[PDB]
């Protein structure tokens, strides 16, 4: 399931 993108890598 898609959980979006995080602002950290």
């Amino acid at each position, epitope marked *: 399931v898609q*959980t*979006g*993108r*995080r*602002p*950290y*890598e």
Partner: antibody, heavy 115, light 116 residues
Framework: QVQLKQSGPGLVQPSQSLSITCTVSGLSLTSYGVHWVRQSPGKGLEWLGVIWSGGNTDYNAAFISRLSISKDNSKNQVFFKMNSLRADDTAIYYC?????????WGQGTLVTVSA | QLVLTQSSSASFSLGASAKLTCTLSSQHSTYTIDWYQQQPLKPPKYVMELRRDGSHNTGDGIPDRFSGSSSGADRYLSISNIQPEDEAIYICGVGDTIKEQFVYVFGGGTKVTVLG
């Protein structure tokens, strides 16, 4: 500890350019992305763009035509540049670095767009 | 559109238990969000990462009385025994890939007033 120190002039004449440097001490930009964010008086936080550790970028589409972010890994500095400023570009501008789980923030640059 | 919805303000009595809501756009109901606490004219402070099963990771300098939970599109920040020090603007944030590009967006912020 980690510190993000912003520098650059804050007064900008309408239609001129805004340049801000973010100097990062205590961690390496080869490992972290740096975001740029701004808040204008009672108008909420706007995300502007980011430069990732590898040097690639992503920009808010409302700003990509006039916004540029680049960096110098050896100096540990990030350069934010926005052209053609208008009255409503008046805001405090912040650099930010996220990690698991938290964020470091620059002190902010108060930007006034005025003649 | 990727949109976070928060009420602009909320009020709680001293010592009460408070809950703030951030609602994700329907097509993004499974997304992880960030909560932030902000004082006027200051950089925001990171509060927590909050995932869709309601589990969370709290940032540095955040006391035990803060926690998070989820319910479908809703993300909650709970503060038990709400203190005057908890008066602040609370903001949620979320990232995504949209047309091959990273985007991040903030909610409008909720101003918390502690009565009494």
């Amino acid at each position: 500890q980690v510190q993000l120190k912003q520098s650059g002039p804050g007064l900008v004449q309408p239609s001129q350019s805004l340049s801000i440097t973010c100097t990062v001490s205590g961690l390496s930009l080869t490992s972290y992305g740096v975001h740029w964010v701004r808040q204008s008086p009672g108008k909420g936080l706007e995300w502007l763009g980011v430069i990732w550790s590898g040097g690639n970028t992503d920009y808010n589409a409302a700003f990509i035509s006039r916004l540029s972010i680049s960096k110098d890994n050896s100096k540990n500095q990030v350069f934010f540049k926005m052209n053609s400023l208008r009255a409503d570009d008046t805001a405090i501008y912040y650099c930010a670095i996220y990690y698991r789980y938290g964020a470091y923030w620059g002190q902010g640059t108060l930007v006034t767009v005025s003649a | 559109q990727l949109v976070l919805t928060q009420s602009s303000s909320a009020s709680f009595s001293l010592g009460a238990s408070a809950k703030l809501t951030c609602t994700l756009s329907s097509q993004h109901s499974t997304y992880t969000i960030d909560w932030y606490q902000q004082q006027p004219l200051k950089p925001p402070k990171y509060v927590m990462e909050l995932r869709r099963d309601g589990s969370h990771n709290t940032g540095d300098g955040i006391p035990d009385r803060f926690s998070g939970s989820s319910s479908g599109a809703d993300r909650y920040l709970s503060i038990s025994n709400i203190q005057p020090e908890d008066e602040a603007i609370y903001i949620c944030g979320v990232g995504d890939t949209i047309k091959e590009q990273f985007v991040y967006v903030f909610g409008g912020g909720t101003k918390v007033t502690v009565l009494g």
